Amino acid sequence: NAVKKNKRVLRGSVKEANYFVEGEASAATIDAVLNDVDLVITKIDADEIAALAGKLNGLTVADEIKNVWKEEVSRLVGAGKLKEGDIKALVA
Numbered sequence: 001n002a003v004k005k006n007k008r009v010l011r012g013s014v015k016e017a018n019y020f021v022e023g024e025a026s027a028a029t030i031d032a033v034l035n036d037v038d039l040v041i042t043k044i045d046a047d048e049i050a051a052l053a054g055k056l057n058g059l060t061v062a063d064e065i066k067n068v069w070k071e072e073v074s075r076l077v078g079a080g081k082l083k084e085g086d087i088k089a090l091v092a
Contacts, residue, residue, distance in 0.1 A: 003046040006053035011037055014069075017062035020089070029089070036090035040072065043081045066090075 011034065019025040019033045041049065055068045070091045076082040 003049055006046075006049045007041060009053035009057055010041060010049065013056040013059065013065050014090075016060065017065040020062055020066050020092070032089035036087045037069075039086065040069075040076065040082075040090070043076055 014020070014033050014037055019029050021029055044052070052068070052072055055071075056065060059065050059068065073082060073087050073091050077084065
């Protein structure tokens with residue numbers, strides 16, 4: 001369904017961004033970034049997932065993708081849904 005497709009957009013975006021590193025991303029880097037993505041996803045409902053997917057859809061620039069994630073994390077921290085140190089690599 002829609003939320004299934006939209007979660008794929010979210011998870012795919014960080015692979016498109018090469019996990020925000022240069023060259024070949026290590027297992028540790030991949031784990032860290034995708035763990036952060038998964039954690040964000042557990043905090044947001046289908047409407048929020050759709051909105052975020054719409055912002056990520058079609059982006060190709062790694063830094064721009066990262067900025068969209070940083071924006072979402074800041075929204076969630078302000079909403080009291082995440083705490084400062086919960087998300088690491090994704091917003092570095």
